[PDB]
Design an enzyme around this catalytic site. Structure first.
Site, PDB file in Angstrom:
ATOM      1  N   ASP A   3       0.848  -1.201   0.000  1.00 40.90           N
ATOM      2  CA  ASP A   3       0.000   0.000   0.000  1.00 40.90           C
ATOM      3  C   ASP A   3       0.875   1.238   0.000  1.00 40.90           C
ATOM      4  O   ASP A   3       1.341   1.668   1.074  1.00 40.90           O
ATOM      5  CB  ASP A   3      -0.883  -0.031   1.232  1.00 40.90           C
ATOM      6  CG  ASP A   3      -1.803   1.148   1.277  1.00 40.90           C
ATOM      7  OD1 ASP A   3      -1.921   1.872   0.275  1.00 40.90           O
ATOM      8  OD2 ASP A   3      -2.462   1.352   2.324  1.00 40.90           O
ATOM      9  N   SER A  35      -0.555  15.698 -11.901  1.00 39.07           N
ATOM     10  CA  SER A  35      -0.776  15.361 -13.300  1.00 39.07           C
ATOM     11  C   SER A  35      -0.997  16.627 -14.124  1.00 39.07           C
ATOM     12  O   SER A  35      -1.561  17.601 -13.605  1.00 39.07           O
ATOM     13  CB  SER A  35      -1.973  14.408 -13.416  1.00 39.07           C
ATOM     14  OG  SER A  35      -2.357  14.172 -14.737  1.00 39.07           O
TER      15      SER A  35
END
Ligand code: NA
Length: 330
Positions: A35, A199
């Site tokens: 994770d 992004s």
């Protein structure tokens, strides 16, 4: 040193991925959910409330000659899905894919929430976010990666998740055979303890690319892609009959649909998520309503590049003094 381990989807939907981990001496192999959105290595154990264990493999510290109680230490964690676990702490030897760390904090669960009990395939979590998020009190502990780092050939790990298929976690090296083209690296903020990056924009299907900054985290422990409501509405508007369902808890679409791809930007590079990756199948067994793999992040307080996005790429988690993320097509 290096390590290399195969990671395997737990079910036909790629809901999560499990990676075998050796704990203790002699080794006890548990299948953990790696994770990158958390920082605790915790396991089902001989201490876990018996009614909360249903099929998991447990760690038994009393059977490990290298286990030592970390006296007084406790832990307690809550995840973004509402799940939780807590317990006490041992140090022990932990190996992943041939890479060994001695003195790793192994957080032994005394209690786990229902979603963990109900998932017989996951024996615990291995956190790979920054150690600033580790929940052990009163002495915070380091992640497996942070303890391995100084021994690694390069201070990196890579995630190469499969679509309906096994993939790989590598530690300490880049496998130049595992991706196509070049790797585009992007800046990381560690301010919230995550692999947080920005992004450069998105496209829906064959549509034009929209240049827009989207801050989010690279999170292998989250199944879906969670993005701003504007972006998600623009995606599902291209699917006839798709809608947001408050009763189901997100966007659903007709199971008869063909989904468009979704592209996200990494600097000037582009990662394309095939439409098929965005199908999470019937909302209930036999339903003709299917659950979408792109969902709104509104109310979650962060955008999450979960497995839907990451498994479309070869992803480098660069833990050098200035951390960065890298993405390549594959
Ligand atoms: Na679900």
């Amino acid at each position: 040193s290096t390590g290399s381990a195969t990671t395997t989807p737990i079910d036909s939907l790629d809901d999560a991925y499990i990676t075998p981990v050796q704990i203790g001496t002699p080794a006890q192999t548990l299948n953990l959910d790696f994770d990158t959105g958390s920082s605790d290595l915790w396991v089902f154990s001989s201490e876990t409330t018996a009614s909360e264990v249903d099929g998991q493999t447990i760690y038994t510290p009393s059977k490990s000659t290298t286990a030592k109680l970390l006296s007084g230490a406790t832990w307690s964690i809550s995840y973004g899905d509402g799940s939780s676990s807590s317990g006490d702490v041992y140090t022990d030897t932990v190996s992943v894919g041939g890479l060994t760390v001695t003195g790793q904090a192994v957080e032994s669960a005394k209690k786990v929430s229902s979603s963990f009990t109900e998932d017989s395939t996951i024996d615990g979590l291995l956190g790979l976010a920054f150690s600033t998020l580790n929940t052990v009190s009163p002495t915070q502990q380091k992640t497996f990666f942070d303890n391995a780092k100084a021994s690694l050939d390069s201070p990196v790990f890579t995630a190469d998740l499969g679509y309906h298929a096994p993939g790989t976690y590598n530690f300490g090296f880049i496998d130049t055979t595992a991706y196509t083209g070049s790797i585009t690296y992007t800046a990381v903020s560690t301010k919230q303890g995550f692999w947080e990056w920005t992004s450069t924009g998105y496209a829906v299907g064959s549509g034009t690319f929209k240049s827009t900054s989207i801050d989010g985290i690279a999170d292998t422990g989250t199944t879906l892609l969670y993005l701003p409501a504007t972006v998600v509405s623009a995606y599902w508007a291209q699917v006839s009959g798709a809608k947001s369902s408050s009763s189901v808890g997100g966007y659903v679409f007709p199971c008869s649909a063909t989904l468009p791809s979704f592209t996200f930007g990494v600097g000037s590079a582009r990662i394309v998520i095939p439409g098929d990756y965005i199908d999470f199948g019937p909302i209930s067994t036999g339903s003709s309503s299917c659950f979408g793999g792109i969902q709104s992040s509104a109310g979650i307080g962060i955008n999450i590049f979960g497995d839907v996005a990451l498994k479309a790429a070869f992803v480098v988690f660069n833990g050098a003094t200035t951390p960065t993320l890298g993405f390549a097509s594959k």
